[PDB]
């Protein structure tokens, strides 16, 4: 390269067109070279790692539910944004991947228990009163929970949504009557129904604490959105 | 020895997990010949393809034009609880797609004449109020005196590839495809001393492109 | 290059076995049907099982001049044309995608040149009192920051008439309300689902002495957080074109069809929303008007309507 | 039977560990066609390559030569909190490298003339105090009346191959590369009755050689 | 780096340890929480009652430097506040958070 | 030959799998750029991903004689030369390494013969009162045992002026302070990073009747423990040459560039430090001076400076 | 499922056991170029081969013939605590073998003359008491006025193939090889007004056949 | 991950069972030459073949 130049290339463009000129501008005594692409930025790789899922409501790190009835946790992105991984997902309008989820059931009492986790497909009718017989019809798993400590278990659910791509944001109504705005229940990986089971009888009703981790397989994203402030 | 490390979820039972059973019968069993038994079924859709009555709609000579005789939404609130073989298959799964075959059997007299317009209107906030409003969708004006049954195809004019089977939310955009209604096009006529009424038996079955996936506990 | 399993992009026999289990993945559904979904690119039945009863835009090598010099361009659609005599941005935000097989068998109804055309959406004023991130909208616009309680159906007057100035242009909601008698809106109120892209252009004529910049944003699925981030520094991730008075008197932006479904439900879903906000507050010359008039245009690109039935407006 | 022995860390969950999930869906799922949806993103750098405003620097006719209009250190205290798409990508990871693309958009009048010198000085204990001291580093004297935007490349003149994204220690040798500042070279001039001020919109995006690695919880 | 940690639990009840890997050069949180540490490459280790639990981890060379120095004659920052140290010259930091049911 | 896994010196597909996991390893980063890093050996951009918007020294066979016999040698650098008439050690401590691609694109500024030359660093006295392990330094030297509280910047007078005698010669800190007007120091105070090797020579003239030995140490990253071990018996692990009065009147030692980074930060890092300590206390003949004068020389080898900006001294 | 049975020692940690670590970093890391850094060491013997002072033995003109100036046993009580680089390598391991290189540097005057006999005697119950008794073993009479350093090889005349590094039992048959001593053969002489004394710097390093095995916690 | 099930007798030690030991020495050891030592015995019968007084 030259050390000096009387007729150098000018460096003024136009960003109003919609795209930034990210090319390194030529300079004397300067040699700009490219760099190899790291696998860290690829969305297929980035989203394959587990991250703590915000529990519905306020985006809390944990959810407390009674051992009497249990709880139902939705796998809906729109429901996750009401609180992190949700902030990372909010950078994309539509997404489609195979969900990987790890649940943690913290048992407070001195006796062991067993958790019944059934997979309710996106679009399926969710029972009003979760029972052992009805949840067995769905794809379920019986997880042994230890006493006075938490037990972890991982699950894999493929893309089962009826939509082509699950939206993290939705400008419209779910039903034709227009009662629910900005939501799509079917646009999710479904709902996970939980029912605690005890062999012993405790005099005091206690509550289980739930923590969730989420990872994605074959992550595909469409229509980018601005990052959160 | 093999150096191993247990991953989370040890001892957990799974209904979709394979390789959990241990042999509770040592000898190799041989089942008796069963090739003599007919009617071997291998798919749940075979039940859906079988006929099934959904509504017994009456029709009298006193019924004037533009008179509604029946109407039902193509949503999990109706199609999953008709009592037909197809409704049970739909209730077992969470999603469905494809065409639906409707068969309106005219069980009246051979001397009876008239027309009943069967209208299928896609998804809308409000159902059709009048006959001409229903006739703005996919319809077929059916003359009852020809062959006994009317073959009315309910097309899958849907927003998405799959429709949800959620009885709690039937009017959702990803749940209902619309409404199917019966209206009196031309009044029922016939000679004197002939029956004043004629019953129409409405059957519903699965089409050749009908499918269901993602099992669940029966919707109802 | 990762320790984790990202998936083999499909279903393999070695994944699920009685000896070992890996993360399950979904395969691509091979479906027949009419090609649709993607705008500008879209153009005997028997069951397969036996029955039991049967037997460069920005480049230093090509610098675009200021408003002074002659650099004309034009945008045409249907029988409509918009001209300019100076440097003007005109970009399709995203490249058009490939068509997909539709689940519905009915043939689409197309409005043609009568529908796919450049319509005068609204005429609005741009004053110098507006600061950074001020969304501008007129009579045909809607106040949409994401916090407004929309009473269903969206056609209700309370949604469009507010105590403060409007901010957004929800598509097609604003387009159908601006021209309810158009052939596009006629099919829109008669069909349960639609499919088309959108092109929005704005013309703001200022002298060589005027200064200021406006950003033409096309926001997908506009919600509370999305609209507020579009006002911020990161908003440029969304489709955008800047109308800088230094060089331009107009700016054009086009975006293809988007939706969770191949066809969008009529009167219940707004895939795209236009936002004309201020980047650099209007800086007019002394002894001249403190506000400039703006003309907003809208253009549906390659429209198709499915599912004909009765008239149900938005 | 296989003779096995468990290594330390049995039952422990790992976010980077593979093969922990058990099937919670027995049937093979088929996803609906999604090829019609445009704007498919596959990398985080694609966001960094998109434009992003970092500073709105004002410039009046009253501003004399050698007047500073703006200055920011190329450290995790600034580049990770500009509000631009690139700052979010930088905050997600622990290390970064490569050139940075700065775009100064002149949103003034076509009748305005003047020069603003953009200076990039590598790492030093003390930042440049005057214009001529800043002009001792890599700079570009920019005439505002030409094309609308100035393409200023911030070269990666670094001590190491990677720079740390630690907001707690931004002035470290393995963290900052230097300072980027804007100074008034030639005063803003223009005819009478023209605006007395002209705003310059400073954008920042990733260069073609920009990279980031080692994920972490957002720096801010 | 290959590292094996041992967590000795004194009380009569079981616990769970959250060990997250903070890359060399990353911003270390002032108040370690479960949500923020989950963004890093973490591992949840079950800790037994009244005894110690061991677990091994593997971390590759992730330092921005070409080679990590055991001795350093100079300052870390340009302001010259920390002498003889290079925080980035390491395999990073391991953040620990105990959890009890 | 070990039961443990030492690593396969890279990333293999069989290491990380859903059935088994082994210790993860890092691979070599293949980078383009200007060749640098190693002293005496150093001599269109597009992104690789699509955008969503785009379409023998010691041998008995060769015994070297004592100070009496003629055995001349010389050391030259730039326009400087140092001669000797007797046996003299002159060794590059470590062999030069291979160049590496630099992360920065700017072309280096070289001082040339004006900078890379043999400079008279300091003149110091060596008395017989100094015992084993006594580090000797003069006016241009610095008291550095590792325990001294260095006030930043190192140019502060309190760092060089102490209550006791100086001991070390931190490079380039001592060289830049000795000659602040040199072309090497001119670029040093103007550039944020530098790269060069170092050669130190000491001349101590004693008669055939004088006895004693001095060790020329080049200590990498001098810290408390390192400096104290260099005084001890194990110190010879560091680069060294002994100036024995029995045979020598001078001793030369050269060391290539070292640093965690390919280029060292100016005014904030001292890769090498010179230490002239006593092995055998000066044993002068009776009726003669009890001290001999020593002349310490310093030589930067193959210098290059990157990142030009304003003047910031050490 | 695989039928497995755990062998004794489940969950036990081993420092020599492989395959215990679980990935705490998901992405494939790439280390920066380090080929520019010289002096790459790969073996512990490289340190042992480097010089190391073990004794500063004085020698005056008043010293008569047969006068002992120094003596040390070639046992872990001495060779592991000389302060030399080799002694640290020996202390790290439990066994050692091979020749040992001793270098006696004469730091006296060029006008000095004399002889110092360096004797190496193999293992014995009692060390040599006199010079002639020490000269019955492997020795070398060294004339100080020639080249500066004396290259004295300490031969591995051992009973076994390996020698133990146990400081608690240095005089064992499988530990020590003998004694190495320095005696005044011919008195130090030189002209008047020359130094009355001359220091001899004794260095010790590993030979070309020196080896060490079986690691342990540093002997001292 | 491999789906495994433990059979009865987990953790039990056996004198005739192989593959229970874990490495307590990482480096590959090399034993000194012992070919100079005579009278190498390899079988217990060799002792039985040697003479032995039973009665006087």
Residue numbers in the entry:
A (entry chain A): 1 to 83, 88 to 233
B (entry chain C), D (entry chain C), G (entry chain C): 1 to 220
C (entry chain B), F (entry chain B): 13 to 55, 64 to 75, 112 to 370
E (entry chain A): 103 to 203
H (entry chain C): 1 to 56
Provide the authors' own sentences about this structure as they appear in the paper:
The AiV1 crystal diffracted to a resolution of 2.1 Å. Based on the orientation of the icosahedral particle and the crystal-packing considerations, the virus particle had to be positioned with its centre at the origin of the unit cell. The electron-density map obtained after 30 cycles of real-space NCS averaging combined with detwinning was interpretable for most of the AiV1 structure. However, some regions, including the surface loops of VP1 located close to the icosahedral fivefold axes and the N-terminal arms of the capsid proteins located on the inside of the capsid, were difficult to interpret. The final AiV1 model includes residues 1–83 and 88–233 of VP1, residues 13–55, 64–75 and 112–370 of VP2 and residues 1–220 of VP3 together with 173 water molecules within one icosahedral asymmetric unit of the virion.
The outer diameter of the virion is about 300 Å.
